[PDB]
Amino acid sequence: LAPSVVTGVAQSSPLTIVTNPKEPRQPVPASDGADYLKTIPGFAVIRNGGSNGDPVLRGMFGSRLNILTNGGMMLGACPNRMDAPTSYISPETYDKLTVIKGPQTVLWGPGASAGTILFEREPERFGELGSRVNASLLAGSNGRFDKVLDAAAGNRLGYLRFTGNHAQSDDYEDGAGNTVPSRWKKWNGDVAVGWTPDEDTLIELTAGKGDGEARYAGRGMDGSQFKRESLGLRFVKSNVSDVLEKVEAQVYYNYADHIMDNFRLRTPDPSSMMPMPMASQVDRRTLGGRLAATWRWDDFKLVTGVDAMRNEHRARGSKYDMMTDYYTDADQFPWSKDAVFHNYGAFGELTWFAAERDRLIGGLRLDRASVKDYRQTLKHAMANPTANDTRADTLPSGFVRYEHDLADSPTTLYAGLGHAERFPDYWELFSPKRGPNGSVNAFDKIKPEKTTQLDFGLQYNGDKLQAWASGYVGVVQDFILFSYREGMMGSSTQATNVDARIMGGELGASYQLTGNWKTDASLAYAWGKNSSDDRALPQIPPLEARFGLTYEEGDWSAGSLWRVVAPQNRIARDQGNVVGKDFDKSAGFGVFSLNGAYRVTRNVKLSAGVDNLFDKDYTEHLNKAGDAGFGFSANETVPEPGRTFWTKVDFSF
Ligand SMILES: [Ag+]
Ligand SMILES: [Ag+]
Ligand SMILES: [Ag+]
């Protein structure tokens, strides 16, 4: 019953991790989706600045991860992914974060090669007329200050719910006393209206908005705006029949409006490729829906449904007349549409409870994906050879999983085969300046990515000791890979298709030593190989381990955490994704941190922490290369923060 601070999350069900994001996390997160996944073994984060990291799962990056918010899909618009999906998510506003590792589900959209991530909010359960609030404030080093509010009121028949947050930090300092360009600010406000005409019905309308700004240690530009707009409507019916346990319909609309420039959060580097004030605006409009029925009968559960999705991308730039140094901002020009994606899918999952200690699950889905290139020209300007052209493909995926509970031990074993196929996304088709060799551009030739992967592992849910492991081996056909070349002026990317082998796993245990002392540990490993070129895959996080120690008496608790990270010597220089490249073997490091928590009232709880107690100067292997405009050298990557203190108070009524 004693309050805690979360240093790491364990796996509770096979392949499935579930956590409540509202608890204090020990490497305290910069109020961003990617930082709440640091806590779960298998995740790493490309650091861009102080916030807005790009999450990497088992070495896979980007659209290989399926990031859902209330079953809806929010996607960002920057061509260089300053606004990864998780930039718009504020996790402590959500109630449940769950992660399914590997291509082992079909219920939540196409192409979840690496895994799916589901932030949800469970609906209110009001009986009498009533209300509830929970809130939190947080203050830390470097001007870090966060407010979070969650309030609802309603009764048997419906409810109003408000969720909001405001969060900011100024530039942090690394372990050497250098201050890192990394100031950020974020806010969100979202409302939900729910109507529950009887206990077998739920209709809910959601709407919300958010904005932010972020300085980027790399990049060469900063993000001055991250406008989000979201509209959602869903519909749940329970127990409509004896076999038809549930029917869920849902429709959602998301809009991202991003602005990047070099004069609002920095001053234009007078000796770069951008000495002139320049901004670029992009937006992304996303409309999509789901409809699914769950059938339960005998020893079988069956979920069948269809989903659909459209999304569109547009952009406009600034202009700088140079011999009259007059600046025309981007809002003075029209939008140029440049891409439209469509997807329609149909899916089903079947669970056979072969009684007792045996479970067998299989799913399939078939997807029709299509894109149209709307760029009339390229970037001064030249013709686009694929203007108005279209591409489509029909892509099937599916999986089988078997689960076995043992006789003696409280042990579950499991193994699964999964095949997943993913249509290339906006960044793989539109951001590279060159496609495969012999191609007119990326849009024309980049093939879908096809992943076949074997997942297996076990859980020991004993008393005193809980343990879990999950491994994976797989091959990827036509893995989409970026290469960087230096043609004198500027850097130029090239997307290609290669074949890859991948493997790895995570394991962890927590032992309850006494009634007061618990210890736990985790290990995460990833390995990747480009078979086409016989060399390592780029941007693969090195071997990582975490050891925690926690004492809890009555109302209070104290924790320690050691994070130790191996060097990464398997690299692929000048290859990577759309965001970063490999360049140098990384050094290992260890980082130590302390936290404490104390329940004052049944409504008020306190916590505090020191991150990086020993002020270690360290950089992660994945982090982006720092920009020549600031104090960063040649492919030196942005360092991690130095010692930081934080304190937090949680309220609940
Ligand atoms: Ag941008
Ligand atoms: Ag620029
Ligand atoms: Ag310019």
Side-chain angles (χ1 to χ4, degrees):
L1 169 59
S4 325
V5 175
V6 174
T7 47
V9 195
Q11 182 189 294
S12 35
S13 147
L15 285 167
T16 303
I17 308 118
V18 192
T19 182
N20 157 36
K22 286 171 177 315
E23 285 130 34
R25 309 216 150 163
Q26 160 77 88
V28 85
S31 155
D32 160 30
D35 288 348
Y36 288 70
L37 311 152
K38 261 160 159 132
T39 325
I40 290 150
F43 288 99
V45 180
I46 302 163
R47 171 172 307 266
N48 283 298
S51 201
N52 299 339
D54 219 315
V56 160
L57 175 60
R58 303 176 153 178
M60 320 302 309
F61 158 97
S63 283
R64 288 151 190 117
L65 276 191
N66 201 9
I67 298 273
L68 259 53
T69 37
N70 288 316
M73 178 155 42
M74 171 95 224
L75 292 137
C78 172
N80 305 326
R81 270 186 76 100
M82 285 181 165
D83 63 339
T86 36
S87 318
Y88 299 94
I89 296 140
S90 267
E92 195 170 351
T93 51
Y94 289 82
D95 308 308
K96 188 153 69 129
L97 166 55
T98 89
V99 179
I100 317 185
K101 298 206 223 84
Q104 295 264 326
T105 188
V106 302
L107 297 180
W108 301 112
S113 161
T116 88
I117 293 121
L118 312 178
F119 301 88
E120 324 177 315
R121 295 185 188 113
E122 206 272 322
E124 304 293 332
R125 276 155 302 102
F126 281 122
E128 280 252 71
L129 181 126
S131 69
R132 59 148 193 84
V133 192
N134 43 82
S136 85
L137 294 125
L138 178 126
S141 324
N142 299 117
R144 171 64 170 290
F145 177 50
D146 299 356
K147 324 167 181 138
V148 179
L149 173 58
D150 188 322
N155 54 34
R156 260 188 48 259
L157 298 196
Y159 59 82
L160 173 70
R161 173 176 191 166
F162 181 83
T163 319
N165 86 307
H166 187 103
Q168 62 176 256
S169 159
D170 197 87
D171 303 301
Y172 68 79
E173 310 167 30
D174 68 355
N178 305 305
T179 89
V180 164
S182 58
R183 186 176 91 117
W184 55 268
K185 208 173 304 166
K186 286 153 139 44
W187 64 267
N188 289 286
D190 310 281
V191 68
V193 189
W195 177 31
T196 59
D198 45 68
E199 38 191 275
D200 290 8
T201 307
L202 166 65
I203 304 187
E204 197 194 47
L205 191 83
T206 56
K209 195 188 248 179
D211 211 349
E213 66 178 41
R215 204 180 310 170
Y216 285 99
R219 261 66 171 70
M221 261 190 288
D222 300 304
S224 72
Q225 174 183 290
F226 292 94
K227 252 149 187 176
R228 161 182 72 83
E229 226 187 45
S230 295
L231 193 55
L233 175 74
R234 64 195 195 86
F235 183 1
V236 188
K237 270 245 190 89
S238 290
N239 306 120
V240 48
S241 147
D242 44 29
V243 280
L244 193 37
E245 184 176 54
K246 178 164 164 107
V247 167
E248 31 195 2
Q250 155 175 30
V251 61
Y252 59 85
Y253 170 97
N254 293 328
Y255 178 59
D257 188 345
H258 170 67
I259 303 176
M260 71 189 305
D261 59 68
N262 65 342
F263 59 84
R264 295 193 170 102
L265 281 76
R266 73 170 75 181
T267 326
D269 183 345
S271 50
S272 39
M273 192 69 189
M274 320 159 151
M276 37 211 291
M278 75 185 309
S280 154
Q281 191 169 4
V282 297
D283 75 8
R284 163 137 291 210
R285 221 181 278 281
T286 288
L287 172 57
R290 190 161 165 279
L291 163 60
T294 301
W295 314 92
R296 187 75 184 69
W297 85 100
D298 196 305
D299 301 336
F300 302 93
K301 179 163 97 128
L302 173 77
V303 181
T304 80
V306 297
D307 54 41
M309 190 220 59
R310 178 209 214 248
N311 69 70
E312 98 166 354
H313 184 264
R314 305 184 310 168
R316 51 184 182 176
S318 92
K319 283 196 126 33
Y320 189 74
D321 195 327
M322 194 153 38
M323 69 165 116
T324 166
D325 66 294
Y326 171 37
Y327 173 78
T328 322
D329 209 0
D331 50 352
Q332 305 298 271
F333 298 95
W335 293 96
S336 324
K337 194 148 75 165
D338 66 338
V340 165
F341 285 82
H342 286 87
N343 191 94
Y344 315 104
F347 58 86
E349 239 174 59
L350 184 51
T351 293
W352 177 32
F353 308 98
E356 307 329 320
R357 320 175 291 126
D358 283 301
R359 272 168 315 286
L360 191 81
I361 318 103
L364 301 136
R365 72 180 279 126
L366 189 73
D367 287 286
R368 166 76 174 187
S370 74
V371 55
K372 174 174 179 167
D373 176 10
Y374 275 93
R375 293 170 299 173
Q376 299 313 276
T377 66
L378 298 175
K379 182 162 153 189
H380 216 93
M382 40 194 137
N384 167 28
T386 67
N388 303 328
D389 288 1
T390 292
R391 279 193 44 173
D393 221 323
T394 304
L395 307 173
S397 320
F399 74 93
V400 57
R401 187 165 68 253
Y402 174 56
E403 316 184 353
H404 186 47
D405 304 323
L406 286 198
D408 40 307
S409 323
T411 297
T412 300
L413 259 51
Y414 74 88
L417 198 65
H419 180 85
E421 288 188 11
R422 178 179 70 84
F423 203 71
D425 64 14
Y426 176 84
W427 305 274
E428 281 149 341
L429 299 185
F430 294 86
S431 317
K433 295 293 122 213
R434 267 153 36 237
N437 297 323
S439 65
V440 298
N441 61 27
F443 180 79
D444 209 49
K445 265 270 288 301
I446 285 296
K447 287 177 169 178
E449 193 177 83
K450 304 197 172 178
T451 290
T452 311
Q453 163 164 320
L454 175 74
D455 275 275
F456 57 89
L458 50 69
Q459 276 141 207
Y460 184 82
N461 301 333
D463 262 27
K464 274 22 180 173
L465 169 69
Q466 312 77 21
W468 63 273
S470 74
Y472 67 89
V473 293
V475 298
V476 185
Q477 187 200 257
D478 294 333
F479 180 93
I480 303 175
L481 166 80
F482 286 61
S483 316
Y484 297 69
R485 206 191 60 56
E486 278 311 82
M488 190 159 125
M489 223 184 239
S491 56
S492 36
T493 57
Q494 172 188 17
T496 58
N497 292 119
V498 304
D499 288 5
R501 309 172 67 73
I502 58 168
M503 84 187 329
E506 307 81 41
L507 47 87
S510 35
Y511 193 38
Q512 184 86 50
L513 302 162
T514 81
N516 302 310
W517 286 102
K518 178 150 224 141
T519 188
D520 47 48
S522 77
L523 197 63
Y525 183 61
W527 181 95
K529 179 193 194 170
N530 182 342
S531 322
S532 307
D533 307 330
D534 193 16
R535 89 184 73 175
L537 277 191
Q539 298 278 276
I540 298 289
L543 166 64
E544 163 155 6
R546 311 197 168 164
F547 315 90
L549 194 64
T550 53
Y551 177 77
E552 38 185 64
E553 249 163 31
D555 277 349
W556 67 277
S557 184
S560 322
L561 171 77
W562 264 107
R563 198 201 160 203
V564 292
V565 169
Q568 176 62 276
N569 301 317
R570 289 180 62 74
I571 65 163
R573 177 171 284 194
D574 282 333
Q575 331 191 289
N577 38 67
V578 56
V579 163
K581 68 206 240 156
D582 271 16
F583 192 71
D584 260 310
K585 299 150 143 206
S586 87
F589 57 89
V591 181
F592 185 78
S593 34
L594 311 143
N595 66 78
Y598 172 39
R599 193 193 304 282
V600 197
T601 78
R602 64 169 208 217
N603 322 278
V604 180
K605 153 204 208 153
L606 261 44
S607 34
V610 184
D611 295 344
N612 195 7
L613 181 52
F614 302 128
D615 198 61
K616 182 64 164 271
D617 186 8
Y618 78 110
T619 316
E620 316 238 28
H621 175 244
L622 293 188
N623 291 358
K624 262 280 275 191
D627 175 75
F630 307 116
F632 297 82
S633 318
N635 301 174
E636 172 207 329
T637 59
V638 49
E640 293 299 310
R643 185 166 86 242
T644 88
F645 300 80
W646 59 267
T647 169
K648 182 176 200 206
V649 51
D650 271 303
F651 301 93
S652 184
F653 302 82

